[PDB]
């Protein structure tokens, strides 16, 4: 609920939500420009997509029980607010979501 609430409050202002869980090849996600982080290549990752039937979808990815992705979708267009490779954050916009890295090591 910690990261879920924040990520949802934010996207609204720029109502409630349920959670769909799916395992995906890292590859299945829309990287677009970005090479897939080396330490993630060929990973099966747990994804939690938040939704309701007023509808745009937010989500969180994880791998070996560590948050690795946070993003939203709008058809073909995914954006990542957060990309981590297990070892280090490569991209962050958590400040938008009023979240720290330490809000992630602690949930």
């Amino acid at each position: 609920k910690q990261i879920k609430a924040h990520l949802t409050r934010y996207l609204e202002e720029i109502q409630e939500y349920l959670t769909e869980f799916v395992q995906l090849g890292i590859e299945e996600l829309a990287w677009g420009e970005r090479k897939i982080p080396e330490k993630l290549k060929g990973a099966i990752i747990d994804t939690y997509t938040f939704y309701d039937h007023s509808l745009i979808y937010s989500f969180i990815g994880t791998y070996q029980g560590k948050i690795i992705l946070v993003g939203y979708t709008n058809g073909e267009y995914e954006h990542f607010f957060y990309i981590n490779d297990t070892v280090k954050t490569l991209h962050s916009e958590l400040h938008l979501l009023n979240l720290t890295e330490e809000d992630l090591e602690f949930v």
Partner: protein, 215 residues
């Protein structure tokens, strides 16, 4: 051949007693989905010699009034989850028909074995029942269908499904395979994949009646 013979082989090849005793405690000391009676609803409604098509899901829906024993299906009254909304958009494009019911019981009747790879889950806990022996069970089910059926379509959505290609004798059987119909994946090529028509082209081609996907 009947599921009960196949189930007998699998349950004698491996010792699911530890799993059975476990799920007994779970169902009497937890809220587990689906209903104990519906764990095999897929096998119930798609008898072994009626399998034309196999669609793998992963995990049963962990929410209330969702899971009833078929991959992707929620109870009639329930509301559409994402993967399933997208499955219907692609069906609308591929085949033409627009399904209103998020219940896939009629697909089961029509010969689509809607098999999740794990068949139980605790309410709210997303991967609660991984690694209790279900995956072994469902692996032997994909194997069994490959082994004792002659011409069957396997639709494999997302990488986890596609790890099951090594169970499927594609000398004997078809494999239609794409990224998962999750909104996160759907646009890296599930949309436009047209697996419903493809499945039927293949079935028509081995002199089998095609799947009616619609209501």
């Amino acid at each position: 051949m009947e599921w009960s013979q196949i189930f007998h082989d699998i349950t004698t090849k491996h010792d699911f007693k530890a799993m059975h005793d476990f799920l007994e405690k779970e169902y009497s000391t937890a809220i587990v989905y689906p209903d104990r009676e519906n764990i095999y609803q897929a096998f119930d409604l798609t008898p072994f010699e009626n399998i034309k098509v196999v669609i793998l899901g992963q995990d049963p829906y962990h929410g209330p009034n969702q899971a009833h024993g078929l991959a992707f299906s929620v109870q009639p009254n329930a509301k559409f989850p994402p993967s399933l909304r997208n499955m219907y958009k692609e069906l609308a494009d591929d085949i033409g028909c627009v399904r209103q019911t998020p219940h896939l019981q009629d697909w089961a009747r029509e010969g689509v074995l809607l098999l999740n790879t794990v068949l139980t889950v605790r309410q709210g806990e997303a991967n609660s029942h991984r690694d209790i022996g279900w995956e072994t069970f469902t692996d032997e089910i994909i194997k069994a269908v490959s082994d004792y059926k002659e011409h069957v379509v396997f639709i494999l959505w997302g990488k986890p499904a596609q790890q099951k290609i090594k169970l499927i004798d594609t000398s004997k059987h078809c494999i239609i395979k794409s990224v998962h119909p999750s909104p996160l994946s759907a646009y890296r090529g599930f949309f436009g994949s047209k697996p419903y028509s493809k499945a039927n082209t293949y079935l028509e081609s081995v002199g089998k009646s095609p799947i009616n996907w619609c209501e």
